[PDB]
């Protein structure tokens, strides 16, 4: 009970499919395993205790089994409202620890991103900094390769990405990549380009502008 580990970190499946989350314990503790569901932006909720006992308001498509150190949570007919992070936890023992969580996503058909690029505003340039923003909108799967090139030079260590939660309507993701330079550095170069590789794109999509 000293350490909980979950597998996998993330999984995808279509609406109506069956999935299984596994929780590995380093030591046995008389099978006192709880499962919690945390929907995006929401508070965790207790789903299952005693490894297999469903709690209030959870659909019968949820099930838990296992013993000793091997424990599992199964959803037998995956629904959009099941999209959440699931945590296992040992209780009635010490120390109280949680698994690292397993993120459950709905799998849909592949969808290429629409790509948009935004130069820095004049207002920001006045402040002495420049951010270039590359937007990848409404795509699936979440995995994407976003690379910055400045005058055909591959860029590293000066960009950060952020990804939305899966959209409740179309099951897609959106992603921002933001390239941040000093004003001087920005004005030192001409061509700014975001190159995007994705399963829905037969060839990479490059969105670019010339400074000015």
């Amino acid at each position: 009970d000293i350490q909980m580990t979950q597998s996998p970190s993330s999984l995808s499946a279509s609406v109506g499919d069956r999935i299984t989350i596994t929780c590995r314990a380093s030591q046995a503790f008389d099978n006192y395993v709880a499962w919690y569901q945390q929907r995006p932006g929401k508070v965790p909720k207790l789903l299952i205790s005693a490894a297999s006992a469903l709690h209030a308001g959870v659909p019968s498509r949820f099930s838990g089994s296992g013993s000793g150190t091997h424990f599992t949570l199964t959803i037998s007919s995956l629904q959009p409202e099941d999209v959440a992070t699931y945590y296992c936890q040992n209780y009635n023992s010490a120390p109280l620890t949680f698994g690292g969580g397993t993120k459950v996503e709905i799998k849909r058909t592949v969808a290429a991103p629409s790509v948009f690029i935004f130069p820095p505003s004049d207002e920001q340039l006045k402040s002495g900094t420049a951010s270039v923003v590359c937007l990848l909108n409404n795509f699936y799967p979440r995995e994407a390769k976003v690379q910055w090139k400045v005058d055909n030079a591959l860029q590293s260590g000066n960009s950060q990405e952020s990804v939305t939660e899966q959209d409740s309507k179309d099951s897609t993701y959106s992603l921002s990549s933001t390239l941040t330079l000093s004003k001087a550095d920005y004005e030192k170069h001409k061509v700014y380009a975001c190159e995007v590789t994705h399963q829905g794109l037969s060839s990479p999509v490059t969105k670019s502008f010339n400074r000015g």
């Binding site: 508070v43 992070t85 945590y87 936890q89 505003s121 207002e123 923003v133 909108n137 950060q160 959106s174």
Partner: protein, 215 residues
């Protein structure tokens, strides 16, 4: 029904002190063990401490000797004194009820309260337009260099919701947050329809409404 309401959080310096409080309703505190559980930046859940009705206290090794938990049964309230704080204590803290009869079974959770520990001063965001340039057009606002979380962003004061994506904040190497908010609109609406992003940053009392013009 059961309601757990946390208060007393916010932003504090390393080595500093905070007192979290939790007001409970829908049940008698005397009959339950009450816990504190936190969700750190890696989104991992971590049990922090617990107190029983008689006042017996328990602490996770990561906070033992630094935190002090207590309760007042008569007020149906509970508190967490958090001292000698470090950046690693940054988290959403939840007041939690344990199932009576079972130890560590968290059946009721509070709303959660954000605690940030950093040496960085509060700072309002600069808000910059992401200006649009064929059917569908994208535009946005860059909300840069603020601290601590959170900010709220709306478009047209909430009147525009469809196609809006507000990205989770990222911590920059400067130790300040940044995020963008974008919206997809018909490109034929550019030039005639007004788009304004409304940014509110309560911790710094900063309020910015930025009009995003084409090009």
């Amino acid at each position: 029904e059961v309601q757990l309401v946390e208060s007393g959080g916010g932003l504090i310096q390393p080595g500093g002190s905070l007192r979290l409080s939790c007001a409970a309703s829908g049940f008698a505190l005397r009959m339950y063990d009450m816990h504190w559980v936190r969700q750190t930046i890696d989104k991992r859940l971590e049990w922090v401490s617990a107190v029983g009705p008689s006042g017996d206290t328990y602490y996770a090794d990561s906070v033992k000797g630094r935190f002090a938990v207590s309760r007042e049964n008569a007020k149906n309230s509970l508190s967490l004194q958090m001292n000698s704080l470090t950046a690693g204590d940054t988290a959403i803290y939840y007041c939690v009820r344990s199932d009576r009869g079972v130890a560590g079974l968290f059946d009721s959770w509070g709303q959660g309260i954000l605690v940030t520990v950093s040496s960085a001063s509060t700072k309002g965001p600069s808000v910059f337009p992401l200006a649009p340039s064929g059917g569908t057009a994208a535009l946005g606002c860059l909300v840069k260099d603020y601290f601590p979380e959170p900010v709220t962003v709306s478009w047209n004061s909430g009147a525009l919701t469809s196609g809006v994506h507000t990205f989770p904040a990222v911590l920059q190497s400067s130790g300040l947050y940044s995020l963008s908010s974008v919206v997809t609109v018909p490109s034929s609406s550019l030039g005639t329809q007004t788009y304004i992003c409304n940014v509110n940053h309560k911790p710094s009392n900063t309020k910015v409404d930025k009009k995003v013009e084409p090009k």
